[PDB]
Design a protein around this motif. Structure first.
Motif, short mmCIF file in Angstrom:
data_model
loop_
_atom_site.label_atom_id
_atom_site.label_comp_id
_atom_site.label_asym_id
_atom_site.label_seq_id
_atom_site.Cartn_x
_atom_site.Cartn_y
_atom_site.Cartn_z
N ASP A 2 0.83 -1.20 0.00
CA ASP A 2 0.00 0.00 0.00
C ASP A 2 0.87 1.26 0.00
OD1 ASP A 2 -2.89 1.18 0.54
OD2 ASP A 2 -1.53 2.19 1.95
N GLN A 3 0.53 2.20 -0.87
CA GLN A 3 1.28 3.45 -0.97
C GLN A 3 0.33 4.65 -1.04
OE1 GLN A 3 5.13 2.88 -3.45
NE2 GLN A 3 3.62 1.60 -4.51
N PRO A 4 -0.07 5.19 0.12
CA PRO A 4 -0.98 6.35 0.18
C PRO A 4 -0.44 7.54 -0.60
CG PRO A 4 -0.68 5.41 2.36
CD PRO A 4 0.31 4.73 1.47
N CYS A 5 -1.34 8.45 -0.98
CA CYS A 5 -0.95 9.63 -1.74
C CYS A 5 -1.59 10.89 -1.17
CB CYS A 5 -1.34 9.47 -3.21
SG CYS A 5 -0.62 8.01 -4.01
N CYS A 6 -1.09 12.04 -1.61
CA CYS A 6 -1.60 13.32 -1.15
C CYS A 6 -1.55 14.35 -2.27
CB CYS A 6 -0.81 13.83 0.05
SG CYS A 6 0.89 14.30 -0.33
N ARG A 7 -2.09 15.54 -2.01
CA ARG A 7 -2.10 16.60 -3.02
C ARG A 7 -1.85 17.97 -2.38
NH1 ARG A 7 -8.47 17.58 -4.70
NH2 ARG A 7 -9.31 17.72 -2.57
N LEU A 20 10.93 18.52 -0.82
CA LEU A 20 10.32 18.10 -2.08
C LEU A 20 9.51 19.23 -2.70
CD1 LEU A 20 10.24 15.54 -3.82
CD2 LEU A 20 8.00 15.06 -2.81
N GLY A 21 9.80 19.54 -3.96
CA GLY A 21 9.10 20.60 -4.66
C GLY A 21 7.85 20.10 -5.36
N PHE A 22 6.85 20.97 -5.47
CA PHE A 22 5.59 20.62 -6.12
C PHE A 22 4.67 21.83 -6.23
CE2 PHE A 22 3.09 20.71 -2.25
CZ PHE A 22 4.03 20.50 -1.27
N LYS A 23 3.59 21.69 -6.99
CA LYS A 23 2.64 22.78 -7.17
C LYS A 23 1.23 22.37 -6.80
CE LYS A 23 1.39 20.24 -10.54
NZ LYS A 23 0.05 19.60 -10.67
N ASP A 26 -0.54 18.83 -7.54
CA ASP A 26 0.52 17.83 -7.63
C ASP A 26 0.28 16.70 -6.64
OD1 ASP A 26 3.38 16.85 -6.50
OD2 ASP A 26 3.55 17.35 -8.64
N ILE A 27 0.20 15.48 -7.16
CA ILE A 27 -0.01 14.30 -6.32
C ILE A 27 1.32 13.63 -5.99
CG2 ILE A 27 -1.15 12.07 -6.11
CD1 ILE A 27 -3.16 13.03 -8.22
N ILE A 28 1.61 13.51 -4.70
CA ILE A 28 2.86 12.90 -4.25
C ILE A 28 2.60 11.56 -3.58
CG2 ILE A 28 4.97 13.24 -2.94
CD1 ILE A 28 4.25 16.25 -2.85
N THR A 29 3.49 10.60 -3.81
CA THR A 29 3.37 9.28 -3.21
C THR A 29 4.22 9.20 -1.95
OG1 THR A 29 5.12 8.39 -4.65
CG2 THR A 29 2.83 8.08 -5.36
N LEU A 30 3.57 9.08 -0.79
CA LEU A 30 4.28 9.01 0.47
C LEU A 30 4.53 7.59 0.93
CD1 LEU A 30 1.92 9.15 3.39
CD2 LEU A 30 1.03 9.95 1.20
N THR A 31 5.68 7.40 1.56
CA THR A 31 6.07 6.11 2.08
C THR A 31 7.27 6.25 3.01
OG1 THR A 31 6.45 3.79 1.44
CG2 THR A 31 7.68 5.50 0.24
N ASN A 32 7.52 7.49 3.43
CA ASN A 32 8.62 7.82 4.31
C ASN A 32 8.16 8.91 5.25
OD1 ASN A 32 10.38 6.08 2.89
ND2 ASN A 32 10.82 7.69 1.39
N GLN A 33 9.03 9.38 6.14
CA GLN A 33 8.64 10.42 7.08
C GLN A 33 9.78 10.92 7.94
OE1 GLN A 33 4.46 8.87 7.59
NE2 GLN A 33 4.59 10.24 9.37
N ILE A 34 9.67 12.19 8.32
CA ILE A 34 10.67 12.83 9.17
C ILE A 34 10.17 12.89 10.61
CG2 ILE A 34 11.86 14.99 9.70
CD1 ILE A 34 13.09 13.52 7.37
N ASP A 35 8.92 13.31 10.77
CA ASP A 35 8.30 13.41 12.08
C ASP A 35 6.79 13.62 11.95
OD1 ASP A 35 9.16 16.11 11.12
OD2 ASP A 35 8.07 16.77 12.91
N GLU A 36 6.14 13.92 13.06
CA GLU A 36 4.70 14.14 13.07
C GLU A 36 4.30 15.45 12.38
OE1 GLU A 36 4.64 13.31 17.57
OE2 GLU A 36 2.78 12.38 16.87
N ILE A 43 8.23 11.79 -5.96
CA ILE A 43 7.41 12.22 -7.09
C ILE A 43 8.23 12.14 -8.38
CG2 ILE A 43 8.03 14.61 -6.58
CD1 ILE A 43 4.79 13.44 -8.34
N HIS A 44 7.70 11.39 -9.35
CA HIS A 44 8.37 11.21 -10.64
C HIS A 44 9.66 10.40 -10.47
CE1 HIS A 44 9.25 12.18 -14.86
NE2 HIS A 44 10.50 12.30 -14.47
N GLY A 45 10.69 11.03 -9.93
CA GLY A 45 11.96 10.35 -9.72
C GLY A 45 12.82 11.02 -8.67
#
Length: 60
Positions: A2-7, A20-23, A26-36, A43-45
């Protein structure tokens, strides 16, 4: 498997290494984290972090 996403609600140009840059829409695939505060994904590559106060996770 499972790979949740956001916008991102607002655009932002990356200026700091590690982030991470975006506009708007822009839909980003999350699967990591720094903190709460700011999460991490790719995204892309490219990987980077993005605080929730800049995006809206579609899949909790």
């Amino acid at each position: 498997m499972d790979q949740p996403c956001c916008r991102g609600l607002y655009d932002f140009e990356p200026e700091n290494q590690g982030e991470l840059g975006f506009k708007e829409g822009d839909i980003i695939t999350l699967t990591n984290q720094i903190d709460e505060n700011w999460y991490e994904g790719m995204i892309h590559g490219e990987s980077g972090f993005f605080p929730i106060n800049y995006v809206e996770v579609i899949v909790p």
